[PDB]
Design a protein around this ligand. Structure first.
Ligand SMILES: Nc1nc2c(ncn2[C@@H]2O[C@H](COP(=O)(O)OP(=O)(O)OP(=O)(O)O)[C@@H](O)[C@H]2O)c(=O)[nH]1
Ligand SMILES: [Mg+2]
Length: 166
């Protein structure tokens, strides 16, 4: 079947694993459990197409740079995640986007900007500023909560659709 190589990136603790585990395992992980590199393979049906989601859940730790170019080259689509209560994670998005573009030789790679932890009250990043950033990249902006599952399928399925349209 058609396989989609999806890669979730972003700063440490923004919820990359929590989003992925919600998608694949239907629950919220509330624990501290930093990732090195996890792979998830799941057969799904999206818009009537049988497909395999091949998802790589990456490390936010900056001490894992080298591993990054490797996975950025083979991924077809990227979720670039920040947390809406962590401005530094938002500011970091530019560095992940630039790194992906450079290793993929492309300024138009399938990507979604994901503002996670939208269940939380203490927001520090306004949705308008992330939407503006996303428009500047020409990609969709989707807000999510791994906690409540708000937006989770929407983000991953939107990314699959971006890959389909590439
Ligand atoms: N309130 C809430 N907390 C969340 C949400 N997403 C993740 N978290 C919490 O934030 C913490 C870090 O979430 P992870 O999913 O481990 O973060 P990560 O981006 O995978 O981190 P690294 O693997 O270290 O890069 C955890 O305590 C999760 O429970 C979310 O949408 N809402
Ligand atoms: Mg993780």
């Amino acid at each position: 079947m058609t396989e989609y190589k999806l890669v979730v990136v972003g700063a440490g603790g923004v919820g990359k694993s929590a989003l992925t585990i919600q998608l694949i395992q239907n629950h919220f992980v509330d624990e501290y459990d930093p990732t090195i590199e996890d792979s998830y393979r799941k057969q799904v049906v999206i818009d009537g197409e049988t497909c395999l989601l091949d998802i790589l859940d990456t490390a936010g730790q900056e001490e894992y740079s080298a591993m990054r170019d490797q996975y950025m080259r083979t991924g077809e689509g990227f979720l670039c995640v920040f947390a809406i209560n962590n401005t530094k994670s938002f500011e970091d998005i530019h560095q992940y986007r630039e790194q992906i573009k450079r290793v993929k030789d492309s300024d138009d790679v399938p990507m979604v900007l994901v503002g996670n932890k939208c269940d939380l009250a203490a927001r520090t990043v306004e949705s308008r500023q992330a939407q503006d950033l996303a428009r500047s990249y020409g990609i969709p902006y989707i807000e999510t909560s791994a906690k409540t599952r708000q937006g989770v399928e929407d983000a991953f399925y939107t990314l699959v659709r971006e890959i389909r349209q590439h």
